[PDB]
Scaffold this active site. Structure first.
Site, mmCIF file in Angstrom:
data_model
loop_
_atom_site.group_PDB
_atom_site.id
_atom_site.type_symbol
_atom_site.label_atom_id
_atom_site.label_comp_id
_atom_site.label_asym_id
_atom_site.label_seq_id
_atom_site.Cartn_x
_atom_site.Cartn_y
_atom_site.Cartn_z
ATOM 1 N N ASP A 35 0.781 -1.220 0.000
ATOM 2 C CA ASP A 35 0.000 0.000 0.000
ATOM 3 C C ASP A 35 0.826 1.290 0.000
ATOM 4 O O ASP A 35 1.352 1.679 1.046
ATOM 5 C CB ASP A 35 -0.967 -0.047 1.192
ATOM 6 C CG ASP A 35 -1.953 1.091 1.270
ATOM 7 O OD1 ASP A 35 -2.049 1.868 0.292
ATOM 8 O OD2 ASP A 35 -2.607 1.234 2.324
ATOM 9 N N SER A 199 -1.089 15.978 -12.003
ATOM 10 C CA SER A 199 -1.356 15.540 -13.365
ATOM 11 C C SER A 199 -1.668 16.771 -14.209
ATOM 12 O O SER A 199 -2.288 17.727 -13.727
ATOM 13 C CB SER A 199 -2.506 14.527 -13.388
ATOM 14 O OG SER A 199 -2.894 14.239 -14.719
#
Ligand SMILES: NCCN1CCOCC1
Length: 330
Positions: A35, A199
């Site tokens: 994770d 992004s």
């Protein structure tokens, strides 16, 4: 030194990926969920409440000659999905695909919420976010990656997740055969303790690219792609019959529809997520409504680039002094 281990999906939907980890002496092999959105190495154990264990492999510190109880140390964690666990702490030798760390904090679960109990295929989590998020009190503990950093050939780990197929987690090296073209690297902010990056935009199907800053985290521990409501609405508007359902808790679409692809920006590069990757199958057995892999982050408070997005790329988690994230097509 280097490490290399195969990660395999737990089911036909790629809900999660498990990677074998050797803990203790002699080795006890547990399948852990790697994770990058958390920082605790916690396992189901001989101390977990008997009724809270349903088919998981347990870690038994009493059978380990290198296990030492970290006296007074406790941990408790609560994940974004309302799941939780807590217990005491041991130190022990932990190895991932030939890469060994001695004196790693292994958090032994005394209590687990029902979400973990029902996942018989997951024996615990291996946190790969920054060590500032570790929940051990009163002395915070380091992640497996932080502990291995000194010994590694390069301070990097790579995630190469498969679509309905096995993948690889590599530590200490970049496999130049695992990707095509170039790796585009991008800045990481560590202020919240996550692999946070920006992004540069998106495209739905064959539409024009929309340049817009989308701040989010690279999280291997989250199945879906969680994006702002504006982006998610623009995507589902291209699927005939798709709608947001309060009853199901998200966007659903007619199972007979073909889904457009989703492109996300990494600097001047583009990563294309195929439409099939966004299909999460029927909401219930026999249903003709299917669950979408692209959901709104409005209720979460953070944008998450989960397995849906990450499995479409070769991902470099560069843990250098100034951390960066690298993305390549594969
Ligand atoms: N509690 C079920 C949720 N889990 C989470 C991890 O992946 C599989 C499904």
């Amino acid at each position: 030194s280097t490490g290399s281990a195969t990660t395999t999906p737990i089911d036909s939907l790629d809900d999660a990926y498990i990677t074998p980890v050797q803990i203790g002496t002699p080795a006890q092999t547990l399948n852990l969920d790697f994770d990058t959105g958390s920082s605790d190495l916690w396992v189901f154990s001989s101390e977990t409440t008997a009724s809270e264990v349903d088919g998981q492999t347990i870690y038994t510190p009493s059978k380990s000659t290198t296990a030492k109880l970290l006296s007074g140390a406790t941990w408790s964690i609560s994940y974004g999905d309302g799941s939780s666990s807590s217990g005491d702490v041991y130190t022990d030798t932990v190895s991932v695909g030939g890469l060994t760390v001695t004196g790693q904090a292994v958090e032994s679960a005394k209590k687990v919420s029902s979400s973990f109990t029902e996942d018989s295929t997951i024996d615990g989590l291996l946190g790969l976010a920054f060590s500032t998020l570790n929940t051990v009190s009163p002395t915070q503990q380091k992640t497996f990656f932080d502990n291995a950093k000194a010994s590694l050939d390069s301070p990097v780990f790579t995630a190469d997740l498969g679509y309905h197929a096995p993948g690889t987690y590599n530590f200490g090296f970049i496999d130049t055969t695992a990707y095509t073209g170039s790796i585009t690297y991008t800045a990481v902010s560590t202020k919240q303790g996550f692999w946070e990056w920006t992004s540069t935009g998106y495209a739905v199907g064959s539409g024009t690219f929309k340049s817009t800053s989308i701040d989010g985290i690279a999280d291997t521990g989250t199945t879906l792609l969680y994006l702002p409501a504006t982006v998610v609405s623009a995507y589902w508007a291209q699927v005939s019959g798709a709608k947001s359902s309060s009853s199901v808790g998200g966007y659903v679409f007619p199972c007979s529809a073909t889904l457009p692809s989703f492109t996300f920006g990494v600097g001047s590069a583009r990563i294309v997520i195929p439409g099939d990757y966004i299909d999460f199958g029927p909401i219930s057995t026999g249903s003709s409504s299917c669950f979408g892999g692209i959901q709104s982050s409005a209720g979460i408070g953070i944008n998450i680039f989960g397995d849906v997005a990450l499995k479409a790329a070769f991902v470099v988690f560069n843990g250098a002094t100034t951390p960066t994230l690298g993305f390549a097509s594969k």
